[PDB]
Design a protein around this ligand. Structure first.
Ligand code: NAP
Length: 271
């Protein structure tokens, strides 16, 4: 019946090669992508058997699209074994911010807020699934950049607010802030839900993937964290030969992780 894993941002890079690696291991991969034609071209391009994947539309920068993707996935009537939050956007050259359809600065909106809504919905599916070895894996970063007292979120994160700490827009820092949000979400997931659900919640940094380690190897590392018994440990950040990486003070701040969660629920319409 083939275990089922959802991978966001599966049409390129780490996510595409993770799709390849898990399809090779006998999994059925849901490629959750925003450009359906680029995704089908990429899967064919890597010679992934069509039995092993299903492409569904997901645009993380639109909260309505997130809910639409979840609807489409649930219509397949496939029990979920794992979720990989891999998609990310980075805009190195912007000097002024870009806002999502929902009104949110696009880097944080895509990399954190859209994933945050997706996680909260698909947690329901992981809980209900009868699989015994269920995992939610978040792609993190090397930096283990600062959210202040989350003033930008406390005020609702609408234009002209463009940074989580409410200070002036900086595009490179917006990216790092968004990856710190990913790390804090992985930590709060473990704290709140690991004992209650038995789901393994962790993160990983696969290495520096110019395009240094290859995209193919990075994808294989994602597959190990998803599938291999040696990585069945909740609440840890894996880094590379793999080791448990101690996190920064800000990423280990449990009050901040909880407050980020509460404010994020509000911003995505879950409160
Ligand atoms: N590259 C590195 O060295 C490195 C290092 C550490 C961590 N990471 C992390 O690894 C993960 C993947 O990175 P990558 O290097 O493989 O980058 P990538 O090749 O540019 O792939 C990013 C994927 O995310 C998707 N994406 C962007 N916006 C989206 C949206 N609104 N909705 C749905 N999907 C969206 C992209 O879709 P499109 O194909 O349509 O553009 C693309 O498939 C990220 O979380 C990144 O932070 C990367």
């Amino acid at each position: 019946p083939r275990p089922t894993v959802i991978i966001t941002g599966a049409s390129s890079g780490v996510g595409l090669y993770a799709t390849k690696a898990l399809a090779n291991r006998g999994w059925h991969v849901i490629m959750a992508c925003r450009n359906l034609e680029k995704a089908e071209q990429a899967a064919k391009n890597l010679q992934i058997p069509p039995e092993a994947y299903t492409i569904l539309h997901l645009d993380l920068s639109s909260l309505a699209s997130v809910r639409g993707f979840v609807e489409s996935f649930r219509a397949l009537n496939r029990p979920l074994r794992a979720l990989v939050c891999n998609a990310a956007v980075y805009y190195p050259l912007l000097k002024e911010p870009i806002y999502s359809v929902d009104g949110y600065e696009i880097t944080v909106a895509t990399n954190h807020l859209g994933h945050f809504l997706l996680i909260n919905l698909l947690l329901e599916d992981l809980k209900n699934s009868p699989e015994s070895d269920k995992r939610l894996v978040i792609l993190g970063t090397v930096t283990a950049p600062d959210l202040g007292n989350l003033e930008g979120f406390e005020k609702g994160f609408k234009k002209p607010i463009a940074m989580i700490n409410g200070k002036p827009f900086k595009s490179g820092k917006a990216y790092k802030d968004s990856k710190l949000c990913n790390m804090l979400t992985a930590r709060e997931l473990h704290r709140r839900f690991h004992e209650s659900t038995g789901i393994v919640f962790n993160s990983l940094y696969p290495g520096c993937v110019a395009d240094y380690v290859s995209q193919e190897l990075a994808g294989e590392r994602v597959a190990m964290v998803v599938a291999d018994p040696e990585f069945r440990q909740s609440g840890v950040h894996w880094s590379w030969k793999a080791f448990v990486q101690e996190l920064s003070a800000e990423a280990s701040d449990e009050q901040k992780a909880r407050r980020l969660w509460e404010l994020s629920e509000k911003l995505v319409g879950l409160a």
